Amino acid sequence: GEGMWVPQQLPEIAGPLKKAGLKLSPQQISDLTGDPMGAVVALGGCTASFVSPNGLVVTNHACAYGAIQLNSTAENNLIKNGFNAPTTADEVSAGPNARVFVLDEITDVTKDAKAAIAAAGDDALARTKALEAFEKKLIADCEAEAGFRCRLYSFSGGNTYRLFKNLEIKDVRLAYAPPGSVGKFGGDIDNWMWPRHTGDFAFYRAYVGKDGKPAAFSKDNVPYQPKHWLKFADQPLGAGDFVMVAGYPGSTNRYALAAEFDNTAQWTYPTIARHYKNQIAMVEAAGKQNADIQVKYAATMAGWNNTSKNYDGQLEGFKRIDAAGQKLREEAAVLGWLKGQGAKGQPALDAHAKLLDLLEQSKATRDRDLTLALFNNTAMLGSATQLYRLSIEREKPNAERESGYQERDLPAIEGGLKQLERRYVAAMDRQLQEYWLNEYIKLPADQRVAAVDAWLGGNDAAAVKRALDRLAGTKLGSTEERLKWFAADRKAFEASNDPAIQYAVAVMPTLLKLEQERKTRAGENLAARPVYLQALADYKKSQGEFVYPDANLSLRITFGNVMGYAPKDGMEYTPFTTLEGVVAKETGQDPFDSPKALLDAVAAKRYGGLEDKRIGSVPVNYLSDLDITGGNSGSPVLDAHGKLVGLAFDGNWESVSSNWVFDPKMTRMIAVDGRYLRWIMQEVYPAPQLLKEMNVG
Amino acid sequence: GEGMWVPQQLPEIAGPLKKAGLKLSPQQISDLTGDPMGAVVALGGCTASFVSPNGLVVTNHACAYGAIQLNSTAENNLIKNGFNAPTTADEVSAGPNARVFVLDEITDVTKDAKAAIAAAGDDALARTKALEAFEKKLIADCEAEAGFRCRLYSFSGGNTYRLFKNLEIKDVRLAYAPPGSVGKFGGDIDNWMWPRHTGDFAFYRAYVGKDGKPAAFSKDNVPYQPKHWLKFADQPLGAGDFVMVAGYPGSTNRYALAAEFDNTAQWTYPTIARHYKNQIAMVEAAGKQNADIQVKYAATMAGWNNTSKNYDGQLEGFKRIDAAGQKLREEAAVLGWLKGQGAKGQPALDAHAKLLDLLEQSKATRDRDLTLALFNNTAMLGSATQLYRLSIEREKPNAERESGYQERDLPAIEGGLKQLERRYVAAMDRQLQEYWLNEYIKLPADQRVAAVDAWLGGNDAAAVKRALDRLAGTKLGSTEERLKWFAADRKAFEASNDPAIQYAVAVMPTLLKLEQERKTRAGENLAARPVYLQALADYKKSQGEFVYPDANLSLRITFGNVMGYAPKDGMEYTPFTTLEGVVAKETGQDPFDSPKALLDAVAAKRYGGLEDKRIGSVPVNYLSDLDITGGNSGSPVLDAHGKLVGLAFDGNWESVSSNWVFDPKMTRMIAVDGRYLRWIMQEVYPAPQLLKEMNVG
Amino acid sequence: VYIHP
Amino acid sequence: VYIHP
Ligand SMILES: [Zn+2]
Ligand SMILES: [Zn+2]
Ligand SMILES: [Zn+2]
Ligand SMILES: [Zn+2]
């Protein structure tokens, strides 16, 4: 059921957990560094888990898709063909920015955090900088121990702060991925849909130095030896069985103002969806003619598809459940309840009004802000502006550099500059700049930026062509050139005649002003948001209702039971899909083209000792009433005894609006069955060595 | 399950029946004039049943549609608005050709029948003529008792003959029909589909004279008082429950040769569906400009829509289950199996070879034969030809007249000429003449008819448009002129300058020779077919398969249980639909425009004492694994105790191909729940007088 | 609908 | 798929 429960709520959900079917004690689950919870790691726009004492890690194919794409080329396309390393020496690096974060300690810092903020008095921007100074000090102290990375989280609008300390594994290698016709069977047609038939899994291996300490890639590094790892279920999963997931959901917005929902539904999601689809069409068209563009833009293209389709789905679900009306009625109730309290209700009412004022400030420039950020997110202008900002920041002492630009951030910045080599073609990027240029010209005069209007010298197709012809002169298209600029000082950027760099230098004062506006807004949110959210919480608690914080990229536990759902009168989705379902969708063309070995094994009924007698086949995917979101991809699904029964990977179509307004009847996790993983590694794209390592072969 | 059992097989299905859950004795189902089977009646194309001691009969809306349409005008459209007689004096005639047939006797006449056929010797045409003479003589003897209509049925290719004798009630009056938005909710979009939400019922009342004998319509007739009528169930029908149907399925083709299947699938069904859709489009466009056309052609339109969609469905179902390949494969196994019996199995093999040869002969003229028949079924050509043929037959003694043209046929003929007044618009019929002339001139040279070329004198637009203008001068567009020709003699037809009568006279010789060709093939079929089918039976038996004859418009029993089906991996259709499912389809536009009283009652949860607890609502339609087809519309669905739980009305999409190859997994009846009948008549379009009449008021 | 075709 | 937007 509903609830992305933080570890600290475990006492509160131990009753419900046992009634749903958990046979482990909740005390065993409370031990976040023990068995099995200590096996769960963050990637961390995704989740994964160890499944071997020798550092083997399972996650989704969608999670490893960036890694797989980084190691693919047009001639040797691992996305299309799959990858299997027969020995550990055959494993390829997953890229310099691949990470596995293993949890080491959580600490509550609420008191000190609120003290730091309170100290700044009545000034909004000082409030933001005080919290930033606190966070940088706290993290620096925490990361004094080598090999560890720390993160400060805010929960329930600034009512609670906790610091997480993680061992940071820096050398992650690709060990196995199925062919993309299994890992992403059905492609974007099946994305966000049930019935699903997708074997969304892949394996990494974590490596550290011989000293045991984390190290960046090196042929002298050796497999990390996790304290705990998961084991496959020995009992078959069936309908109604207990399941639970622990993972790292990114964000939900269930506590938003009705006005914030209204703007997201009316402007944000349709705007983004549209921009994403425009860019998708262009790049699709270009890739059809050029196999190098196709492989190089594959990961970008997966994200644009996923997010655009998710937004279309949310807009549809909002209409399905009248979300706009449910937010308006619920807020009326909260605001009435507060007014019924005179004195002690006044601060939440004041807070409400301020959040509305801030929403209105943000709206005034929303088109300029979005369009600018996306324009500057193309590969050459993104690189130039990042590199030039770094050069500015390096002039300050480290403690005073903007987060993202401190010494601790250097490894990631540099890694991103190299990774872009596999994700960049100038001919494609020029069409993306052209699209964003044409969108900037349609903005009204009051949403324009002087520095961009000047750099353009006009408002017509000829100015656009000139700007593109000039940017074509940049040398930032080669990796070695981006890395030169990574080390160069401010003056050097300000002297250069590279047109991408000249663009950076000219817009940067403006970027810096917008950031101050965001920081000032965020400073007032820091005062108003905790106060309004405490009042929501107190209202829902007085209503009986569930109280848990919105997702914030920290570790959460959700639980429930395998079950389908009823999309309409006269029908039901069943909880499992089966091998014969995969074959029934076969067309022989992308995205319904399974490997031939899969088609043969199914036709010959080779079930590999993994058949569930209750469904007459080997299960493929299943539905359950768990509460997951973006960031839970790859999370392990554990049964009544803490054994691995699948991996979380998607939501059904009707579920996606639950980010704003939760609908119990139509919100289900979609997961890939562990037996399907095993089946593929037996009969389809064989990996006898990993099965034995795990050890189910 | 599978099986359209004749009542003489009851002995054999007695244990299957008890195991499926029947709680009456099979002996009680055997009594065809007893309780409850004596309540089941034939309408001629549909089934119905008595439901009160005062002659009340329930059937489908789709079954009463003809009668409802006959009583409708553009100003007072009963199809749209429904009909309700507060008293029996308010009941209107269903039309002069409506009938209720109440079964009196069945006798086996096989020995005499095949003796009469044998006495013709080795001559195909004489073989047909011999059976014709035997049939007529038998019927005339059976029909000597006033008030009774008899029919000879051939089963299993001519292996068995039985004579049915029925009481012929020929004053049938409409008592109730719900609005078309209930009786046909979802229109042609939902036709042949589940989930279904359609209140497919209507009520007639049957009349006889004061002496108690049948009589045509008279204001002095009184309601028939049936010996037996059905009672509504007192137990709630649920998933898994026993159900059975008795009724009058038209035709199945499960024992056809494979070549016969291939012929139907590749040529017959696509040809007809194509022609039907073309005529739909024409009449649909004229309907929009003209409500008189719209209402006068609404019955014809429901027929074309229904059949053309059914054939579309069947073509899809053949592909889904490789029907071609199954026929091929079973044919091989029977043939293989026959020659493994040398001398003994040689007749069957001769028989197969001959049937094959008759199919080729038939195929030779099929474009001609079909185009001519459809051309001659336009309103004025149909009338002129039928009426000319009648005048020819009237010249012979009645015993020698063609079936369909004997004295016993006269009421049906005269009634049909009257009912055409409500189904005929000159302007519309002109466009269908044009259509068919155009299709005719498109035929290749072999495939043409001499007489039609001559009459037409040309093969281009000029010829057509002359024929049309020529035919515009017929006087047969009025009912009084049709009846004048109904009584006129042959010489008077031959003297006439009416252009449509002139056509009829010009082509009758041709039609007569075609009729003779057809009767020759049928006479060769008469010898071959039964020998082969006894063999197919003998084989199926040895394979322990189900053996029952293909449908032939006689009375059958099917039984089974309420259950859904799985159209696809990951999904299941539930056995029931509910009221809420009806309102969820509301669009406010035809065909999803429920009456307000229905939207309002469902909103207020006005369930009228009829909610089934297991589904939270009043049930609407349900699925079950019975084996029904065309002709079963209107059949009562009886429960374990022989009480009424619904009416059969449709099949699901995947089921329609079961006409040729039976698929148990995807073959279901759709039925309207008795409780939804009652609901509608309580809460939506009330008829508390009928409810009180049926003891449920 | 299962009327006669 | 539940990767980060
Ligand atoms: Zn146990
Ligand atoms: Zn250089
Ligand atoms: Zn009983
Ligand atoms: Zn006249």
XYZ file of C-alpha atoms in Angstrom, chain B residues 87-409:
323
model
C -52.771 -2.151 -20.991
C -52.983 -4.992 -23.437
C -55.333 -2.912 -25.612
C -52.274 -0.612 -26.005
C -50.128 -3.398 -27.518
C -49.431 -2.825 -31.292
C -48.987 -5.538 -33.946
C -45.370 -6.771 -34.402
C -46.290 -7.112 -38.059
C -48.131 -9.623 -40.226
C -45.111 -11.930 -40.562
C -44.199 -12.115 -36.857
C -44.677 -15.629 -35.370
C -44.492 -17.627 -32.193
C -43.925 -21.330 -32.681
C -44.667 -23.599 -29.668
C -43.370 -27.052 -30.033
C -45.961 -29.846 -30.237
C -44.184 -32.957 -31.534
C -40.962 -34.311 -32.965
C -40.990 -37.556 -35.044
C -38.053 -39.397 -36.591
C -38.657 -40.028 -40.350
C -35.195 -41.020 -41.440
C -35.988 -44.524 -42.838
C -38.889 -43.250 -45.042
C -36.924 -40.163 -45.977
C -33.868 -42.061 -47.246
C -36.060 -44.734 -48.917
C -37.791 -41.914 -50.831
C -34.419 -40.549 -51.834
C -33.104 -44.028 -52.859
C -36.181 -44.721 -55.024
C -35.026 -41.920 -57.320
C -32.067 -43.996 -58.578
C -28.728 -42.683 -59.756
C -29.985 -39.218 -60.986
C -29.054 -36.044 -59.068
C -32.031 -33.793 -60.028
C -34.508 -36.608 -59.442
C -32.936 -37.210 -56.056
C -33.719 -33.616 -54.953
C -37.240 -33.872 -56.501
C -37.913 -37.081 -54.678
C -37.069 -35.526 -51.249
C -39.083 -32.395 -52.135
C -42.085 -34.609 -52.960
C -41.630 -36.613 -49.746
C -41.254 -33.435 -47.623
C -44.349 -31.741 -49.079
C -46.501 -34.784 -48.679
C -45.358 -35.218 -45.059
C -45.877 -31.586 -44.120
C -49.337 -31.506 -45.706
C -50.323 -34.521 -43.624
C -48.829 -32.974 -40.484
C -50.552 -29.585 -41.157
C -54.064 -31.031 -41.649
C -54.763 -30.143 -38.000
C -55.599 -26.441 -38.113
C -53.269 -24.046 -36.339
C -50.015 -26.015 -36.790
C -46.880 -25.397 -38.928
C -44.453 -28.255 -39.584
C -40.869 -28.389 -40.693
C -38.569 -31.135 -41.934
C -35.022 -30.944 -40.598
C -32.051 -32.822 -42.030
C -29.250 -33.515 -39.537
C -25.584 -34.482 -40.074
C -25.619 -34.214 -43.878
C -28.756 -36.257 -44.388
C -28.035 -38.981 -41.822
C -31.128 -38.237 -39.834
C -34.451 -36.564 -40.590
C -36.958 -35.369 -38.017
C -40.269 -33.633 -38.488
C -41.107 -30.879 -36.028
C -44.737 -29.931 -35.574
C -45.381 -26.517 -34.016
C -48.378 -24.457 -33.005
C -48.197 -21.398 -35.203
C -49.240 -18.233 -33.386
C -49.583 -15.506 -35.904
C -50.873 -12.519 -33.892
C -47.802 -11.278 -32.055
C -47.866 -7.853 -30.533
C -45.189 -5.662 -29.007
C -45.772 -5.047 -25.257
C -42.489 -3.390 -24.246
C -39.182 -2.284 -25.583
C -36.664 -0.125 -23.744
C -35.160 2.876 -25.544
C -32.540 1.945 -28.138
C -29.894 3.549 -25.918
C -30.495 0.618 -23.515
C -31.539 -2.189 -25.945
C -28.539 -1.484 -28.109
C -26.220 0.552 -25.838
C -22.843 0.847 -27.546
C -24.411 0.266 -31.010
C -22.141 -1.190 -33.637
C -19.076 -0.227 -31.665
C -19.811 -2.612 -28.839
C -21.490 -5.289 -31.114
C -19.607 -8.598 -30.950
C -17.559 -7.320 -27.998
C -17.031 -7.570 -24.287
C -16.926 -5.781 -21.973
C -20.628 -5.382 -22.838
C -23.229 -3.106 -21.170
C -26.347 -3.652 -23.236
C -29.965 -4.172 -21.924
C -30.774 -6.405 -24.896
C -34.452 -7.370 -24.139
C -37.996 -6.679 -25.238
C -41.418 -8.202 -24.705
C -44.121 -9.490 -27.003
C -47.549 -10.924 -26.332
C -49.072 -13.737 -28.193
C -52.711 -13.809 -29.258
C -55.113 -16.377 -30.604
C -58.811 -16.282 -31.477
C -61.694 -16.677 -28.994
C -62.081 -20.301 -30.115
C -58.409 -20.675 -29.002
C -57.052 -21.495 -32.482
C -54.387 -19.269 -34.056
C -55.565 -16.445 -36.187
C -54.017 -13.476 -37.912
C -54.391 -10.003 -36.357
C -57.869 -9.173 -35.147
C -59.011 -6.730 -32.462
C -61.140 -9.637 -31.247
C -58.258 -12.000 -30.491
C -57.276 -12.754 -26.888
C -53.896 -13.589 -25.225
C -52.664 -17.161 -25.570
C -52.588 -19.019 -22.234
C -49.465 -21.124 -22.261
C -49.291 -24.395 -20.362
C -45.744 -23.493 -19.189
C -43.863 -20.225 -18.590
C -40.589 -19.490 -16.978
C -40.048 -17.928 -13.532
C -37.291 -15.451 -12.636
C -34.593 -16.821 -10.420
C -34.836 -16.249 -6.683
C -31.157 -17.174 -6.149
C -28.437 -14.615 -7.262
C -26.358 -15.891 -10.210
C -22.660 -15.780 -9.566
C -19.348 -16.650 -11.138
C -18.984 -20.453 -11.523
C -22.767 -21.122 -11.421
C -24.424 -23.651 -13.726
C -26.229 -22.253 -16.721
C -27.972 -23.761 -19.716
C -29.673 -22.545 -22.818
C -32.288 -24.083 -25.070
C -32.908 -22.405 -28.396
C -32.734 -22.449 -32.150
C -29.204 -22.035 -33.572
C -29.194 -21.449 -37.354
C -26.114 -22.898 -38.913
C -22.632 -24.059 -38.009
C -19.925 -25.336 -40.369
C -17.778 -27.442 -38.102
C -17.844 -30.523 -40.447
C -17.079 -28.757 -43.698
C -14.293 -29.895 -45.974
C -11.153 -27.703 -45.749
C -11.626 -26.536 -49.248
C -15.117 -25.341 -48.206
C -13.495 -23.428 -45.342
C -10.849 -21.948 -47.701
C -13.506 -20.894 -50.099
C -15.493 -19.065 -47.393
C -12.504 -17.422 -45.732
C -10.724 -16.249 -48.917
C -13.732 -15.339 -51.070
C -17.271 -15.478 -49.478
C -16.818 -13.542 -46.260
C -14.561 -10.711 -47.606
C -16.819 -10.315 -50.680
C -20.048 -10.018 -48.651
C -18.540 -7.849 -45.935
C -17.244 -5.531 -48.655
C -20.624 -5.280 -50.359
C -22.371 -4.814 -46.989
C -20.034 -1.966 -45.936
C -20.570 -0.233 -49.288
C -24.297 -0.342 -48.893
C -23.944 0.800 -45.237
C -21.977 3.881 -46.274
C -24.522 4.782 -48.959
C -27.508 4.393 -46.695
C -25.769 6.027 -43.746
C -25.041 9.206 -45.886
C -28.668 9.433 -47.221
C -29.901 8.809 -43.651
C -28.263 12.047 -42.359
C -30.141 14.152 -44.975
C -33.396 12.248 -44.442
C -34.965 10.793 -41.282
C -37.594 8.977 -43.333
C -34.777 7.047 -45.011
C -32.994 6.691 -41.711
C -35.903 5.042 -39.910
C -37.264 3.040 -42.923
C -33.791 1.448 -43.522
C -32.679 1.034 -39.805
C -33.475 -2.700 -39.677
C -31.680 -3.435 -42.966
C -28.764 -1.369 -41.680
C -28.562 -3.315 -38.384
C -28.442 -6.527 -40.459
C -25.635 -5.374 -42.763
C -23.647 -3.969 -39.794
C -24.111 -7.166 -37.789
C -23.147 -9.600 -40.451
C -20.293 -7.632 -41.939
C -18.751 -7.154 -38.480
C -19.247 -10.812 -37.690
C -17.419 -11.852 -40.861
C -14.649 -9.335 -40.082
C -14.469 -11.067 -36.721
C -14.388 -14.515 -38.172
C -11.551 -13.647 -40.631
C -9.518 -12.323 -37.649
C -10.331 -15.448 -35.562
C -9.144 -17.806 -38.338
C -5.799 -15.969 -38.307
C -5.594 -16.097 -34.524
C -6.038 -19.886 -34.351
C -4.641 -21.069 -37.752
C -8.046 -22.425 -38.812
C -6.740 -23.128 -42.321
C -4.000 -25.261 -40.884
C -6.275 -27.049 -38.432
C -8.767 -27.985 -41.182
C -5.874 -29.151 -43.423
C -4.448 -31.203 -40.617
C -7.663 -32.836 -39.472
C -8.671 -33.583 -43.095
C -5.293 -35.333 -43.613
C -5.866 -37.411 -40.470
C -9.376 -38.471 -41.468
C -8.314 -39.332 -45.018
C -5.154 -41.173 -43.853
C -7.412 -42.951 -41.404
C -9.965 -43.945 -44.062
C -7.574 -45.652 -46.471
C -6.084 -47.540 -43.563
C -9.350 -49.445 -43.918
C -9.146 -50.438 -47.581
C -12.538 -51.654 -48.813
C -14.562 -50.594 -45.758
C -13.595 -46.891 -45.915
C -13.741 -46.528 -49.661
C -17.262 -45.046 -49.890
C -16.257 -42.114 -47.599
C -13.325 -41.496 -49.882
C -15.484 -41.504 -53.045
C -17.820 -39.197 -51.126
C -15.028 -36.713 -50.318
C -13.859 -36.711 -53.914
C -17.425 -35.916 -55.138
C -18.066 -33.134 -52.557
C -14.828 -31.630 -53.694
C -16.033 -31.799 -57.305
C -19.328 -30.096 -56.410
C -17.414 -27.283 -54.761
C -15.444 -26.654 -57.939
C -18.666 -26.667 -59.957
C -20.150 -24.175 -57.543
C -16.957 -22.033 -57.548
C -17.172 -21.785 -61.311
C -20.076 -19.324 -61.248
C -19.887 -17.845 -57.784
C -19.376 -14.165 -58.786
C -22.271 -14.341 -61.221
C -24.447 -16.285 -58.773
C -23.943 -13.922 -55.831
C -24.068 -10.691 -57.784
C -27.278 -11.779 -59.472
C -28.933 -12.853 -56.207
C -28.014 -9.622 -54.435
C -29.082 -7.537 -57.443
C -32.447 -9.366 -57.468
C -32.947 -8.626 -53.743
C -33.316 -4.842 -54.184
C -36.932 -3.915 -53.276
C -38.623 -3.615 -56.709
C -36.771 -6.399 -58.486
C -37.221 -8.669 -55.527
C -40.957 -7.950 -55.531
C -41.443 -8.257 -59.312
C -39.533 -11.600 -59.539
C -41.146 -13.158 -56.517
C -44.568 -12.129 -57.711
C -43.970 -13.314 -61.266
C -42.707 -16.683 -59.970
C -45.841 -16.958 -57.820
C -48.043 -16.476 -60.922
C -46.121 -19.210 -62.683
C -46.508 -21.628 -59.746
C -50.220 -20.916 -59.255
C -50.753 -22.637 -62.573
C -49.694 -26.078 -61.208
C -51.562 -28.188 -58.624
C -50.517 -27.081 -55.155
C -48.678 -30.348 -54.469
C -46.319 -29.584 -57.410
C -45.607 -25.987 -56.539
C -42.132 -24.963 -55.453
C -41.625 -24.693 -51.648
C -41.985 -21.009 -50.761
C -44.783 -20.689 -53.374
C -47.404 -23.129 -52.118
C -50.688 -22.222 -50.536
C -49.075 -22.593 -47.084
C -46.632 -19.847 -48.066
